[PDB]
């Protein structure tokens, strides 16, 4: 809150503008990264109620309806095992949205193979 | 009034290991569940500290150089240690400290005293014998504070002269080992700071019978520690950054 | 003295932003690789070895 | 937004323009209790004062001196300082204070000053030319004077050499006015050095006794045990204020804390080594200091060719501390929250997006 | 005098570390490409043109 | 080897720690690069005589 320090800091030009601009570029690039990784399908697919996949069992990778976050057991294990003018900006996609995107990808690749990645 | 003693049996002082004691709070700052590293005058872990004995005949009251920092440990029972002597030459030519604890309260005085070559007390089994000085010419600061007080009780003390502030640290520790120091960790809190602002480079610890008494002397050295603060804010463990490579 | 503090803290901030940009470039390369893996291994079957 | 982008036309998007800062309202200072007052009552209003040739030097140290009470007392007829400022006594710090108390005539008061030549300055009490401090004098007609003449107070009248600074002379050696030898026996030109004052109440202004106490400061390398008083204001909590606690100054919001300090500890620091809790010197309680709720201000706008309506996001700011809707990204004002879901147009953060259809969130 | 020398040499060292980090990112990209070539051309037959 | 210069350098904080950490990261990164390019098989094969 020092006024004399800020008065001196105006003599240094637009260094602060450069740093804020670079950090803003990094911040939007993180969201762009998450979009390009996960938001690859515009149809949200759901798995059928009957899990008859010819003996194949996807319960460890499919979402658990019991959990409040609707995460898979492996996803829940991953989230459990990974633990002055500065502000932390929240990501655009929440963990629930990324879980829904992953769930849509899993449902598409289980019920439709590779066809959902190239069209209907 | 001073008296020479000659009934001592001559014996060199012993040395003993320091173990993992001597860590004190470097500042008045609270910390919780964090690891803090600081550069301050610290006693290296597992070093030889001078050992002074008093038993019957031993009555060790030598005069030692202060250097830049001194560690006092005292496996003390029935309170045989009653004071301390701090100064440069310990006579009326110069100015020294008088830090004592008699039967009523503790007195801190900064005066030009005339200390005896053999300063000692005496208790009749009631104390009525005070032989620690012969004159007191010019005082410059007087201070009265609250009293600080098989070997049962342990007293730890650290003394420094940094920029005219005389920092005293202390802890009372319940011990049950008879002969030597115990093994364990104990953080020393700051008890009193004395704004003395004087030169100090030498010090002394304060028929007949020699009561069961013992104490230790260690020296502080500039180095770096890594101190662990718990949730309640007490220093539970420390790491010397220059002791051995694992700690580094 | 304030100018000395300003240039020191400004140098620290610029160093932080520069290393953040470098880490962001590395993370962006990793995320582009992750998107490529998502497209070619999840949305299809890949003939590329390893 | 136009000013920040330096263009009159702004395309659709969200732009960080300003930085929100909750300005402090009050200025709070707490300092510990004013204890251990200096024993000024046994000095400046004692029973009897000393002579000028054998002045008692009283040393004031290890206490706080409240110079306001002494300065506001109107009974001191002369309150003159020569090296410091009277209006700055209550802020500056000094190692120790030496009080030189003596009794002289009402006209000889001025001679206790640098650069003055006289009987009192040369033979009774001398100050250095680089003296600092204050010379304080007050009338003592009603205390020292007696109907039969107060002859107790003696002063040195003849000495062979001028006095050195702060030098006493308690010897009664016989002065030799002429050149004839004197071995301590008075003669034609040999008189006693010390003379008694003729203090009588009937005399006017000019002969009345004045009790004069002179304070001299020392600036040695020892700590300044003598400092001025401290004025602590009231405590206001749960507001962004300016706090200065025992030299630790800054801005924050002060609330009650459940952390338990050890009794010696005063300050508290987090993992990042920034102050987060301080113990109040007046009342032994621990106040958690959270920073005042700053945030980056973002402006949500469609293209200026479409509309001039804008929505404002205060990133990481609670809506109660600033069409007012609370998101996990911050407080969003100017956008009406809808319960329906669309495709993202302008990203806000934490799953929220803004679009123009009025601006909807 | 030592402060002048310290700020100059620290600026030089930070600059050196900055281009070292940038060239390390470039070399890491090249090594990732080389590992991909090893996997897809040495450990298999690639359909990717050129 | 100057102790006064190092004392003055300590007042600049942790710049040296950052530079050393970045250089160490680059150094281990080079080894990781070599491992990921060449150590793709944990099986050592020899051509027949
Ligand atoms: C698919 O796999 C899951 C887990 O691998 C099976 O769930 C187990 O079911 C048995 C009996 O129903 C339980 O004793 C186990 O505790 C379950 N495992 C877990 C992790 O909960 C499931 O039965 C399999 N088959 C189908 C059709 O879902
Ligand atoms: C106890 O012994 C010491 C050491 O012999 C005495 O200290 C000396 O005292 C004489 C005076 O008699 C001085 O001339 C010496 O300079 C002293 N020595 C030192 C090293 O200072 C001490 O006086 C003795 N105590 C009594 C009461 O005589
Ligand atoms: C301490 O000193 C004694 C003799 O001076 C020596 O025997 C001992 O080994 C020393 N302690 C250590 C830990 O080196
Ligand atoms: C302890 O020392 C103080 C300081 O001189 C004195 O006033 C007091 O009477 C002493 N008490 C005893 C029991 O000797
Ligand atoms: C110190 O004491 C001696 C003897 O008691 C005395 O001559 C001298 O004046 C004293 N010093 C001061 C500064 O009073
Ligand atoms: C203190 O006195 C000792 C002599 O015992 C001397 O070596 C040292 O230089 C003195 N220090 C100061 C600061 O006067
Ligand atoms: C901290 O103090 C509380 C006192 O209620 C105690 O219950 C707790 O065990 C202490 N913490 C540790 C780590 O001992
Ligand atoms: C004399 O001075 C002392 C200074 O401490 C003051 O407390 C006292 O009130 C004064 N006496 C009178 C009668 O005002
Ligand atoms: C200081 O004064 C306050 C208010 O009277 C009191 O609560 C407190 O106990 C006093 N003492 C200390 C050491 O703060």
Author numbering:
A (entry chain B): 745 to 827, 856 to 892
B (entry chain B): 14 to 69, 77 to 145, 153 to 176, 185 to 241, 257 to 298
C (entry chain B), E (entry chain C): 992 to 1041
D (entry chain A): 299 to 620, 641 to 675, 691 to 694
F (entry chain C): 745 to 793
What do the study authors state?
SARS-CoV-2 utilizes a trimeric spike glycoprotein for attachment to the host cell receptor angiotensin-converting enzyme 2 (ACE2) and for the subsequent cell entry step which involves the fusion of host cell and viral membranes. Given its crucial role in the viral replicative cycle, the spike protein represents an important therapeutic target and is a critical antigen in host immune responses. All emerging variants contain defining mutations within their spike proteins, with multiple mutations clustering within the receptor-binding domain (RBD) impacting both ACE2 binding and antibody neutralization escape, while mutations within the highly antigenic loops in the N-terminal domain (NTD) across these variants reduce antibody neutralization. Given the rapidly changing mutational and antigenic landscape of the SARS-CoV-2 spike protein, a structural understanding of spike protein mutational effects and the discovery of broadly neutralizing epitopes is of importance.
To this aim, ectodomains bearing variant spike mutations were used for cryo-EM structural studies. Global 3D reconstructions were obtained at resolutions ranging from (2.25–2.5 Å), yielding open trimers with one RBD in the up conformation and 2 RBDs in the down conformation for all spikes. The resolution within the NTD and RBD was insufficient for accurate visualization of mutational impacts within these domains, due to high degrees of conformational heterogeneity. In contrast, we were able to confidently model sidechains close to, and within the S2 domain, owing to its limited flexibility. Additional mutations were visualized within the Beta and Gamma variant spike proteins, with implications for inter-protomer and intra-protomer contacts. The A701V mutation in the Beta variant S protein lies at the protein’s surface and the larger sidechain conferred by V701 may enable tighter interprotomer packing with Q787 on adjacent protomers. The Beta NTD contains a deletion (Δ242–245) which spans the 4–8 footprint, along with the R261I substitution spanning both 4A8 and 4–8 footprints, leading to escape from both antibodies.
